[PDB]
């Protein structure tokens, strides 16, 4: 069947859209070539719709069947419960899209009578009606990128397909607890969204080390959500429901599956019928968990069919990395082709074909890779990093255009040990926060697509807990890494690293002069900027942080919120 059908009605914006980065001295101090930075808008929505609309064929074999059997068996070991109204409401991001039924995220979080009463009626309706398709809205995401000189043109907007706020809260009640337990039970250490960056690093290094002769590859499915079939989605349901659950959860999950997850009508922001979906909904609670489980089953079966030897997989939704025992360079290329052929039969054909890789630094999982640097005592330290182009371009946008999501803060947290997050992002944003006098204000950001809230004044403690003390002291990064960072700065017309060090001395001094938590930030975050280094010691606040499952609770992304 076709992933989508369309009426001809346009995808429409909900608020005024801006395509270009403003010319502004503040953003200009981060990067000068403003014309290279763009934001996707509804203008490119029809192009994406064409891209994500195609026919799916799916043929399953004995390899697939066997994997699925193991997974349902693993799933049966899970016991999960419904979330209460209060628990599901508290998971709602403060700026989650408002309901058409006279309330918004604020009313949900505060448990207002109108919101709670509506949500109860939506739940009851799910239990009583397991058939009527539930309406969704389709929107074009507004996201910022830099032009790519090797891709030719600008990216088309991604599309998001989501149900009313009332339904989103019900999704949490029915399935949130499952997102916290099922992926781990089914694929164990292969579930990527349970890991902090330092933990992902540890996993990759260990998978690499355990092979006598490691070969790695990433598999890029062309538009994964669109490749997900109605049968895949019902299989997901059977996996969810293999868990031990109360009857009421079974009913709600079955109903959500038939009325929402397997498909349904799409409306534009003007309320016009826009099309009909028959693939994965991109904006539901189960998008990431569903993708992760379905990618895993198909990929694991594909490894077996293809003769991939001793596969170790890292799965993060549709993002897949496979590390295995090389069979020789010619054999590896043959086996990868076979893998692709099997994934294709299972209805997950490739975008760019996979390529055998024999150097871990060059393997990307979720756009990130493991690199190596030296700690304060000359010890080798591994850390996660990525090309900084998109982070810096978004940072520049965020400095001059209000956004409820501060990607710069999420990048500093996830990529704290990197030379680019330290020298560029920390330097730039601490200077801005001091000028605004808003150092202490909590800010929302995303990690793995879920929403979090922290104060920048708590960064040293958070960074130490997540990444260790050495994150404040790495030096002697690799030529690959330094070359990539310097290239990105040059491309964006940003000041080079040496100029950031000059700026950071003054930012550091300013932070220290304020005493308190600000001075802690100055001493810890910017110890790299001064010749005479302070000896940094463990922060008492770091051990007091509840972060052990900080990533797990985001469920791989969605309409999910947590505060620190």
Would you say 319 and 366 are in contact if contact means Cβ atoms under 8 Å apart?
yes
Among candidate residues 365, 458, 462, the one with its CA nearest the CA of residue 413: 462
Cα–Cα distance for residue pair 240/171, rounded to 1 Å: 13
Q: Which two tokens stand for residue 163?
A: 């149900």
Cα–Cα distance for residue pair 106/205, rounded to 1 Å: 43
Strand partners, 167: none
Cα–Cα distance for residue pair 148/393, rounded to 1 Å: 12
Cα–Cα distance for residue pair 175/73, rounded to 1 Å: 19
Cα–Cα distance for residue pair 162/557, rounded to 1 Å: 13
Cα–Cα distance for residue pair 151/167, rounded to 1 Å: 39
Q: Which two tokens stand for residue 204?
A: 């990759």
Q: Which two tokens stand for residue 349?
A: 């054909």
Way the structure was solved: X-ray
- The DSSP call for residue 315 is E
Q: Which two tokens stand for residue 38?
A: 């763009």
In three-state secondary structure terms, 323 is: strand
In three-state secondary structure terms, 499 is: helix
- Strand locations in 34-133, DSSP E? 37-39
Q: Which two tokens stand for residue 537?
A: 């010691």
Would you say 344 and 350 are in contact if contact means Cβ atoms under 8 Å apart?
yes
Would you say 383 and 201 are in contact if contact means Cβ atoms under 8 Å apart?
yes
Cα–Cα distance for residue pair 46/65, rounded to 1 Å: 37
Q: Which two tokens stand for residue 59?
A: 């043929």
Cα–Cα distance for residue pair 453/461, rounded to 1 Å: 15
Cα–Cα distance for residue pair 187/206, rounded to 1 Å: 17
Cα–Cα distance for residue pair 359/361, rounded to 1 Å: 6
CA angle centred on 505, ends 501 and 510, rounded to 5°: 145
Which strand (E) or helix (H) includes residue 226? helix 224-227
PDB resolution in Å: 1.9
In three-state secondary structure terms, 563 is: strand
Residues with Cβ within 8 Å of residue 70, at least 6 apart in sequence = none
- The DSSP call for residue 422 is I
Instruction: Give the distance from CA 124 to its chain's centroid.
Output: 32
Sign of CA dihedral 321, 326, 327, 331: positive
User: For tokens 């002291």, what's the residue?
Assistant: 473
Q: Which two tokens stand for residue 200?
A: 């992902």
Strand partners, 323: 216, 312
Cα–Cα distance for residue pair 106/159, rounded to 1 Å: 25
CA 372 to each of CA 369, 474, 543: distance values in angstroms, whole numbers, following the listed order: 10, 9, 26
Cα–Cα distance for residue pair 121/101, rounded to 1 Å: 12
| Backbone angles phi and psi of 302, in degrees to 5 | -65, -40
Q: What is the 3-state secondary structure (H, E, C) of 229-256?
A: CHHHHHHHHHHHCCCECCHHHHHHHHHH
Sign of CA dihedral 344, 347, 352, 356: negative
Cα–Cα distance for residue pair 326/335, rounded to 1 Å: 10
Among candidate residues 417, 433, 210, the one with its CA nearest the CA of residue 324: 210
Cα–Cα distance for residue pair 405/318, rounded to 1 Å: 23
Among candidate residues 356, 353, 384, the one with its CA nearest the CA of residue 448: 384
**Would you mind telling me the total number of residues written for the chain in this entry?**
564
Instruction: Give the distance from CA 303 to its chain's centroid.
Output: 25
Half-sphere exposure of 155 (CA within 13 A, CB side): 18
CA angle centred on 365, ends 362 and 371, rounded to 5°: 45
Would you say 160 and 283 are in contact if contact means Cβ atoms under 8 Å apart?
yes
Strand pairing report for 319-325 and 214-219? antiparallel
């Amino acid at each position: 069947s076709m992933s989508y059908s369309w009426t001809g009605a346009l995808i429409t914006p909900c608020s005024p859209e801006e395509e270009k980065l403003p010319i502004n001295p503040l953003s200009n101090s981060l990067l000068r070539y403003h014309n290279k930075v763009y934001c996707t808008t509804t203008k490119s929505a029809s192009l994406r719709a064409k891209k994500v609309t195609f026919d799916r064929m799916q043929v399953l074999d004995s390899y697939y069947d066997s994997v699925l059997k193991d997974i349902k068996l693993a799933a049966s070991k899970v016991t999960a419960r419904l979330l209460t109204m209060e628990e599901a409401c508290q998971l709602t991001p403060p700026h989650s899209a408002r309901s058409k039924y006279g309330f918004g995220a604020k009313e949900v979080r505060s448990l207002s009578g109108r919101a709670v009463n509506h949500i109860k009626s939506v739940w009851k309706d799910l239990l009583e009606d397991s058939e009527t398709p539930i309406p969704t809205t389709i929107m074009a995401k507004n996201e910022v990128f830099c032009v790519d000189p090797t891709k030719g043109g600008k990216k088309a907007a991604r599309l998001i397909v989501y149900p009313d706020l009332g339904v989103r809260v019900c999704e949490k009640m029915a399935l949130y607890d499952i997102t916290q337990k099922l992926p781990q039970a089914v694929m164990g250490a292969s579930y990527g969204f349970q890991y902090s960056p330092a933990q992902r690093v540890e996993f990759l290094l260990k998978a690499w080390a355990e092979k006598k002769d490691p070969m790695g590859f990433s598999y890029d499915t062309r538009c994964f959500d669109s490749t997900v079939t109605e049968r895949d989605i019902r299989t997901e349901e059977s996996i969810y429901r293999a868990c031990s659950l109360p009857e009421e959860a079974h009913t709600a999950i079955h109903s959500l599956t038939e009325r929402l997850y397997v498909g349904g009508p799409m409306f534009n922001s003007k309320g016009q019928t826009c099309g009909y979906r028959r693939c994965r909904a991109s904006g539901v609670l189960t998008t990431s968990m569903g993708n992760t489980i379905t990618c895993y089953v198909k990929a694991l079966a594909a490894c077996k069919a293809a003769g991939i030897i001793a596969p170790t997989m890292l799965v993060c939704g549709d993002d897949l990395v496979v590390i295995s025992e090389s069979q020789g360079t010619e054999e590896d290329e043959r086996n990868l082709r076979a893998f692709t052929e099997a994934m294709t039969r299972y209805s997950a054909p490739p975008g760019d074909p996979p390529r055998p890789e024999y150097d871990l630094e060059l393997i990307t999982s979720c756009s990130s890779n493991v690199s190596v640097a030296l700690g304060p005592q000359g010890r080798r330290r591994y850390y996660l990093t990525r090309d900084p182009t998109t982070p810096i371009a978004r940072a520049a946008w965020e400095t001059v255009r209000h956004s409820p999501i501060n990607s710069w803060l999420g990048n500093i947290i996830q990529y704290a040990p990197t030379i680019w997050a330290r020298m560029v992002l920390m330097t730039h944003f601490f200077s801005i926060l001091m000028a605004q006098d808003t150092l202490d204000q909590n800010l929302n950001f995303e990690m793995y697509g879920a929403v979090y809230s922290v104060s920048p004044l708590d960064l040293p403690a958070i960074i130490e807990r997540l990444h260790g003390l050495d994150a404040f002291s790495l030096h002697t990064y690799t030529p690959h890494e330094l070359t990539r960072v310097a290239s990105a700065l040059r491309k964006l017309g940003a000041p080079p690293l040496r100029a950031w060090k000059s700026r950071a001395r003054a930012v550091r001094a300013s932070l220290i002069s304020r005493g308190g938590r600000a001075a802690v930030c100055g001493r810890y975050l910017f110890n790299w900027a001064v010749k005479t280094k302070l000896k940094l010691t463990p922060l008492p606040e770091a051990r007091l942080l509840d972060l052990s499952s900080w990533f797990t609770v985001g469920a791989g992304g969605g309409d999910i919120y947590h505060s620190v």
